[PDB]
Amino acid sequence: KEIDVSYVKIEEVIGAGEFGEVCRGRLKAPGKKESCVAIKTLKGGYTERQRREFLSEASIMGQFEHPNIIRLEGVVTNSMPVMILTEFMENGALDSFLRLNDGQFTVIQLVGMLRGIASGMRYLAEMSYVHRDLAARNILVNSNLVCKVSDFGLSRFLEEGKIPIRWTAPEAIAFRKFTSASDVWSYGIVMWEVMSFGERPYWDMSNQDVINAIEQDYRLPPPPDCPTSLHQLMLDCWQKDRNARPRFPQIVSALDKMIRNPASLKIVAR
């Protein structure tokens, strides 16, 4: 959906992306009220291949419509600079948002965030889309604490960017078989990131140390104050046999049960 350049106002540069700046702005189109948008720009000095990779994210995002998936507003391609516009997520990336707010949200709030992420993933799996880079740094958060999946692209990993080892299921590392079940492994890592308020998975371990540890049956321990039932769900996501892991509909169901029976979240390890 091509957007007339005159409908777009850039207000402030708010971050740095893979291909250039990330901005906050306003979109005002005839017959519609003004709305806030995030804007990524691609400025001159790039290869034609880079332009396609940049715009591919908009093509893929535009295939989806779900409250926990970032919404595309449109693109600017018949003019320079090239732009992609989405809904504006006032709290930015989830991992840094939680680090800024360490210990300041309740267990029930954290579970609600995890439920939104799992609902977005349930939708992607139903659409036969495998994310491959599910991580808290790729979840965006709005003013109401709603969490939405971002970072869309179908390009192969370098070995087939590099494979994100700490988030990746062991069969995907070893054999490059990426499936919704490998995204479930990654989702378990995201759960650990959320319940630890943005700690780095596996701390200072090297990538090869992580690979070897997982093969030797190590799994991340419960974060401080984490309900045991949430850590058990993490362990279920981290089963070595991909066919034994829960599927995303089952994950959403488990989180919904916790929200409805919050007394079950009181048990914590000693």
Ligand SMILES: Cc1nc(Nc2ncc(C(=O)Nc3c(C)cccc3Cl)s2)cc(N2CCN(CCO)CC2)n1
């Ligand atoms: C970098 C950043 N993004 C924010 N919100 C975003 N919403 C949507 C974004 C976005 O990337 N969409 C998008 C995607 C996903 C793909 C292609 C194209 C596009 Cl356009 S980025 C907020 C933010 N903050 C800075 C720090 N704090 C403020 C100061 O205290 C909190 C807020 N920082």
